[PDB]
Structures are given as structure tokens and as C-alpha cells.
A paper describes a structure:
However, using purified [name] (chicken) [name]α C2-domain (81% identical and 93% highly conserved sequence relative to human), we obtained crystal complexes with 1,2-dihexanoyl-sn-glycero-3-phosphocholine (DHPC), enabling structure determination at 2.2 Å resolution. Three C2-domain molecules comprise the asymmetric unit and each C2-domain contains one bound DHPC molecule. The C2-domain–DHPC complex exhibits a β-sandwich topology formed by a pair of four-stranded antiparallel β-sheets (one formed by the β4, β1, β8 and β7 strands; the other by the β3, β2, β5 and β6 strands). In contrast to the two bound Ca2+ ions reported in the lipid-free structure, we observed three Ca2+ ions coordinated in the PC-bound structural complex, consistent with the established Ca2+ dependence of membrane interaction by the C2-domain. We found that the Ca1 ion is bound via side-chain interactions with Asp40, Asp43, Asp93 and Asn95 and the main chain carbonyl group of Ala94; whereas Ca4 is bound via interaction with the side chains of Asp40, Asp43 and Asn65 and the main-chain carbonyl group of Thr41. CaPC, which was not observed in two previous lipid-free structures, bridges the C2-domain to DHPC via its phosphoryl group (3.6 Å) and sn-1 carbonyl group (3.2 Å) and also interacts with the Asn65 side-chain (3.1 Å). Although Ca1 does not coordinate with the DHPC molecule, Ca4 does interact with two oxygen atoms of the DHPC phosphoryl group in bifurcated fashion (2.1 and 3.7 Å). The only direct interaction between the phosphoryl group and the C2-domain is a hydrogen bond with the side chain of Asn65 (~3.1 Å). Importantly, the Tyr96 aromatic ring stacks in planar-like fashion with the cationic -N+(CH3)3 group. The DHPC polar headgroup docks with the CBLs, whereas the fatty acid chains are largely exposed to solvent.
Numbering used by the authors:
A (entry chain B), B (entry chain A): 15 to 140
The structure:
């Protein structure tokens, strides 16, 4: 049964970059995408901001999790385009590291120089 | 005598622009400069953020004011460069519109499309 509520708040990122050459062509237009393969709603995403290497989203998402399935959070940092969007990086979070009732601020890192702040919590359905 | 403490918190700006052509050449690298000609320290400024059209500064400044002088706040939105920095816009605030003990959130506008959030307060010296 799916009985665990996994809340993810994507707060902000700092120094988003496509690389030296990539940034010269196009200032990153970042959004974040959240993916849990084991969850019933697999994929979610934040809005994008144009031309902002330190975007602030403060968007909150809720997943419904099965405690008996392997649940892993995939966080993808994206650059929006008119053409096809570009994947800048990906970081994973083992949700099995959290414990019920726990709320935690997690900082992820992309391409060594980019950081992202998340706030993760886990509760029962009620 | 200088006996009024005028506190200014520059919080953030949204959609900073140098214009259509200017933005294509250079994504704004914004900072804010504060100027009160009648104050003993005339000029102050925030740090800049590279390539960020929605910068967040949250920097607090303190001016000392003479209640018998005309005190007007000049807010200049700047773009940082290696060369000479460029002036994007200027907005004024009559400090004689504030009351002692009053604390107020003010939103300024530059070039019709750029907004800036300030937090202004006025107290007497302790
Ligand atoms: C290199 C010289 C300028 C190229 C450039 O980045 O500006 C053009 C514009 C800039 O695109 P951008 O400012 O990044 O804004 C669009 C962002 N999206 C696609 C997410 C709405 O995109 C196109 O029109 C092509
Ligand atoms: C198309 C035109 C490309 C200009 C450009 O933005 O890329 C070059 C980069 C632009 O510098 P930028 O990323 O805006 O930031 C330099 C750091 N500041 C803004 C403090 C001078 O370095 C320059 O010397 C100009
Ligand atoms: Ca651009
Ligand atoms: Ca861009
Ligand atoms: Ca883009
Ligand atoms: Ca640039
Ligand atoms: Ca720039
Ligand atoms: Ca600049
Ligand atoms: Mg920003």
C-alpha cells in the first residue's frame, strides 16, 4: 500500500552553469524536475526563470510512497529552451535515509560548482 | 543636529533589463546604489550578482539624518562591468513621507518593466 507522504520543497539554486562556452551562448534559464520511479505520479517540475543563474522557486511537491518499494529521488537541473531543453545535471537522494516525522534541509551539487537547496520531509498518510 | 536613523533594506529586484539589444550582449549583473545628498555618508551600495535578472541582496544600510534638512533617497539600479558600470535607472523616495517608528515595504519601478522591493524604517537615535 502507498501510505508514506514524501514532501519536497525546491527552494533555490546558486551559480547554475552550462559551462564556460555554454554560458556565453545562453544564460541558463533554469527549472528543476523531480522523478521517483516507484511513485504513482512519476514526474514533476518547477517553473523556469529566464536568465537567472541563482533562481529562487520555493515550490512544494508531494509524492505518495510505498514503504516496501525502493524509493529513490532523482533531481534534474534543467535549462529551458524554445527548441529542446538541456539537461545540466542530475543528483539522487535515497529516501530510505529519512525517517518519519523528520524534516531536513538538503544541499545538492551539480557540475562541482552549482548548488541547490531542498527541504525534504516524510510523514504517514493519516 | 543629526538625530534620525533611516534604515534601508534592499531586498530584491525582478526582471532587471538593459533593454532588448543590451540583454543580448550582456545579461545584467545588478547591484543597487543608495544616495542621500543631505546625509553625512552620501553613498552606499550592495554587492553585485553576475548574470541574474532577479537578484536577491537582503542587505541593510543605515543613514543618519537631519530632520531640518530636505532628505531625499536616490536609488540607482546598476549593472556591473569590467569596464565602466552602467546606469540602468534611478528612482527617488521622499523620506519626509515616513513617520517615526513606521516600517514600510516599498516597491520601486525602473524602465516600466523592472521592479525592486525595499523595506524602509525611521527611528530616532537611541
Ligand atoms: C549569442 C547571441 C544572443 C543569443 C541569445 O541568447 O539571445 C536570443 C534569445 C534569448 O533567449 P533567452 O533569453 O534565454 O530567453 C528565452 C528563454 N526561454 C526559451 C526559456 C523562454 O533566444 C533566441 O531568440 C534564439
Ligand atoms: C555575445 C557577447 C558576449 C559577451 C559576454 O557576456 O561573454 C563574455 C563575458 C561576460 O561577462 P559577465 O559574465 O557578464 O560577467 C563578468 C563579471 N562582471 C559582470 C562583474 C564584470 O566576459 C566578457 O569579458 C564580456
Ligand atoms: Ca540569453
Ligand atoms: Ca537564456
Ligand atoms: Ca536556455
Ligand atoms: Ca553574460
Ligand atoms: Ca553579464
Ligand atoms: Ca554587466
Ligand atoms: Mg536570482
Amino acid at each position: 500500500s502507498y501510505s508514506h507522504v514524501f514532501t519536497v520543497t525546491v527552494r533555490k539554486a546558486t551559480n547554475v552553469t552550462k559551462g564556460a562556452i555554454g554560458d556565453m551562448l545562453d544564460t541558463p534559464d533554469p527549472y528543476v524536475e523531480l522523478f521517483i520511479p516507484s511513485a504513482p505520479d512519476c514526474r514533476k517540475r518547477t517553473k523556469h526563470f529566464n536568465n537567472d543563474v541563482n533562481p529562487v522557486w520555493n515550490e512544494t511537491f508531494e509524492f505518495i510512497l510505498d514503504p516496501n518499494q525502493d524509493n529513490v529521488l532523482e533531481v534534474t537541473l534543467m535549462d529551458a529552451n524554445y527548441v529542446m531543453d538541456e539537461t545540466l545535471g542530475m543528483a539522487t537522494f535515497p529516501i530510505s535515509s529519512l525517517k518519519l516525522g523528520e524534516k531536513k534541509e538538503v544541499q545538492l551539487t551539480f557540475n562541482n560548482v552549482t548548488e541547490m537547496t531542498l527541504e525534504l520531509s516524510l510523514e504517514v498518510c493519516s
